[model samples]
Target: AGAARSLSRFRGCLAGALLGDCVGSFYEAHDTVDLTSVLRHVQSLEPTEALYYTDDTAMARALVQSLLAKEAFDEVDMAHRFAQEYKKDPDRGYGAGVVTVFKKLLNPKCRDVFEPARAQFNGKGSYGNGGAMRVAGISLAYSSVQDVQKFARLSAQLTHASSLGYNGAILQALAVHLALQGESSSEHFLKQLLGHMEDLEGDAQSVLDARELGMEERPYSSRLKKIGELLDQASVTREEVVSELGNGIAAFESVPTAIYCFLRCMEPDPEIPSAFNSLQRTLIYSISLGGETDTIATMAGAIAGAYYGMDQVPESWQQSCEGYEETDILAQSLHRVFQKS
Candidate 1:
């Protein structure tokens, strides 16, 4: 698909991102499991309530609302919405740290927590995958390089203050932005990305590592699944992510690698069902490869969705998606952005 392709391409990406959030949540823990297995996981919950989303979709919903308000990176607005959404869904799946942060946000006295307290996290701050999980919208609204950098930072900081975390999200958004633009092949995309950013040695290093990672490296997607299994076991940390999936959380650890998996299984040899099969195989493989499978799968799904077009998604899967209206609105808004951009 070219930049001149129909608006639905972008919608496909947006909807795919949400569907991935909803479905990926099911296989979030097990490396070997995928959506099929997750349905069984909820066996008793037979007509399962569409498998409600957690922080991933909640944050994604907030991003769409923020974008519609034209406040791409407004930290305060994001903080307010973040808290509001969490309060609304007390049952949403939240990371330990995220739950702590939202709990503090609800306190009248801790109103400034996201700004002040979050930055004071023993100097480590936060480089969690929370930021990257919701950044596909930045790609949707990619009008220029400035918009990319600006919104990436804005979206990243909404939940994280760590430069590392923010940068990872930015890089991920950059990938989505570029993929939607369809200006470069997967290989060229990496080269062009590295060509743009000269500063940030960590980011540079991570990108280089990602570029060099090959099939010999334990099959990239498999590594992602390993991380998911670890998380499902309730074991996650900056050190753990790094030890298993690499710590930088920048382009190398997250973005480029995820894009690589997407590119690898990119086109479904036939059509619809084949495309879906390609998506399913890639999704399960990619998710299982990371400690944060949700985010990894989210990245993979975001890009692949854009590449495949929305209608290709199974109706069964679409019905499984949690926030259809918000996602639909987001898809439309993103489509408008894609058209305008």
Candidate 2:
């Protein structure tokens, strides 16, 4: 399995993520998703048109650009890239929190690159879905699970310092790492995540964050277990998934929802078109969930992309997205970075 490293999956991960972000913007924030509207939007995309990406792909490109340039994660380099990109264009739909982070990163004398994010939300350092959405590249650049989690966490902390925030990056990274490994078993994928989360959520900071938020001692571990419960049900409901796993801006809710979207799409669904392949179902279903649409779609699409490889990616969708070429090149660059590692 490891004999021939996969360029297809690597390119698929980023291309899939780019398309997800581009399409999600079409229906950015609707409380209820109408599947018909979603389908209509997908077909409406002209093969030659250029659809812009949101901050999800923007930050991901910045993260990987720094990673490939430095041959590793560099706090200053990555943070500088993030800030400079924001400075170049202040309006890519970046949130107030990260916007503030970029402004502070401009401080000439600030020694701690993380101080800005750590100061956010009265020192709680937001647990938003921001980190997880942009972290797929870390999985591609690092073969080892530990490196993926570590880099993902480190890169995210410049904007998301809370344990829940950075750890969401870890969860999403590990998900991509496993997904890139030639399509893994669903149970093992869930089980592997749970095992890692159990250890990570037990960290002192994780426990403290959960305690402060009035959640279980190991909140992410609890959620992973909940994913298992959802998987076993024949009576799976959108309400059930949206309720238990959640569908919100908080990493606590959105990250798990992304994973659930990917896992659920493994089987064919009546809701998705029969003509559509697995990756298309993933992108459509993720957006159709209608909560943190771009983030969930990009995250799950990246996972599905990695799992299914580039062959499953729709060429027409790729042509319509803005971040396609850069992400495509970035994904290839990470393959070399992986070899360097």
Candidate 3:
């Protein structure tokens, strides 16, 4: 299978990524919404109803546009585009670190967002999940494992020069790439992805610690539960996974756990719907069990899309997406691009 087959999976991954984020965005506000109290009905976009996408979708759209425009990773342009979008539409609800960087760009105080040597985290650099959020595109754009690491690093460094932020995007891209290739067994998938993780960059302490954590073999729930443990510290807990994962600020927290969420959903399961429900419920469980809700849901959505594809996404729910028509068109275009590639 060449372009057509690849494109099919690409669209599947893209749609999955978008839909997952949109669905979870609805629940992002409150960390805890009882599944029973919340409408269990399949989601449909309502004209009168207004549901908004946060920085996650905003940054994600930029990455897709960037990928579409260049057809490859361009560090300088990627950083420029990222800065431009934030400056052009500061109301798009950009996150703190990115907003700070954008504000600096708008003020003309900083002309460059690409120089890995002149980063915002005061040379230590960011470890935010922002890099990971938009990284699925990198994973789907390339056809094989060979290019994922190199381009992923480029994508992350565009905004997150810090190894913490960079690694976050790097690993998430790795997961999405492996997922597209139908690489089953979550552990095997992660090992393959993490194999490319380099230790030279980002926060040395964070990177060293995360790398060690990656080596530990624990059930997905246990790992997530551990994240909850870390988040309990006022310094660590965050409403968004990006907040905890550096929200694209750094590579360490952002990338490692995004893949963790995906892997949790990818675990050996009884049924597809069952797996989806289980992961979805786990978000609720995490809330009761004490963990971040939005990010967990977001990652769970990635898992669902990776394993189930668009058709299994439930038409009723797809119809409920924020920009059903526009999303469908983008999905079609992405699918077409995959075919052409």
Candidate 4:
């Protein structure tokens, strides 16, 4: 195998996710988050009260631990960890859909484990971003793109059975996978991502889920293409970006938005403070877009940190997050495991 990626990138990925998850809670469902509020939450001479990360951080942390212990994707272990983690910390702001799924998993009769989520929404499963939000660690733990996709998609099915749901997981995993591989153009990056989705969307189940939801087939592919067009213009408004890309809770809505924010923030944005680095800009810009702020920022943070490494993640901001130290510790362990592989 080629040389493993540095531990710095690994820490950045986990730390970035943790920080974004913690601070992102402040504007989770707001219509449009303001910079004044974002700065207030982000900037301070001294660390204020510690901000807590929601379901996004906990799920991924559990998954990372599971991967390290099992040395592979273990559905049963992963399922147990998720259910146990949720049980231990029920107030992580989990959506009702996942909450119900977790409850079912804890049920004595839950044999298949996946059956509960598979039985959700009339068996089409959830199309929410829950799957994507918890998948960045899967990218960091695996070296092969195929392995990352396989595990990430399978792990998503532990909670999300809808093709749209799991596919978003694959997309988020690949976005981080691409970033961790080293530098690439936004044009090239989106194109590579679009190609992966194009292949996945070819599956009948993916199209079937899309059609069932009243969406056109291959919604994410279409969304990625639209991202290309949106980035072409010199300027784009928050409303337009939300209207076109969407900032809702759905996986189709926010994962693409995260990728777009990560890519677009590479350039200077007047709305984001120039003092802030790209990773910071990406998170704030993601937050400013609104709905499901934590998920979007967490996903974007994964991508940004993968690209920029741990140096770009601010230490003060890290300490302010609830699980920053543990996240960094997990990152180091995960990187060691990744290297051993």
List candidate 2 segments past 4 Å from native. 1-5, 46-49
How accurate locally is residue 148 in candidate 1, as Cα lDDT from 0 to 100? 83
Q: How close is candidate 1 to the true structure, as a TM-score?
A: 0.73
Total clashing pairs in model 3 = 26
Where model 4 places Cα greater than 4 Å from the true spot, the runs are: 1-4, 45-49
What's the lDDT for residue 293 in model 1? 57
Model 3: ten consecutive residues of lowest lDDT: 282-291
User: lDDT at 8 for candidate 1?
Assistant: 61
The local distance difference test score of each candidate is: 0.60, 0.86, 0.52, 0.87
Task: Give me the candidate number with maximum lDDT.
Answer: 4
lDDT of 1 by residue, 78-148 (tens): 67677888888767776666666666666777645456435435644465677887888777766676788
Off by over 4 Å in 3: 1-5, 29-49, 106-111, 198-255, 267-292, 338-341
After best superposition, candidate 1 residue 103: deviation in angstroms?
A: 3.9
| Residue 218 shift from truth in candidate 3, angstroms | 16
Better by lDDT, candidate 3 or 1: 1
lDDT by residue (69-180, candidate 4, tens digit) is 9978889888989999999999888878888999988986887878888988887799899999999989988878899889989999998999888999999999999888
Off by over 4 Å in 1: 1-6, 31-49, 107-114, 202-256, 267-281, 288-291, 337-341
Query: If scored against the real structure, what TM-score would every candidate get?
Result: 0.73, 0.96, 0.71, 0.96
**Alpha carbon lDDT at 9, candidate 3:** 57
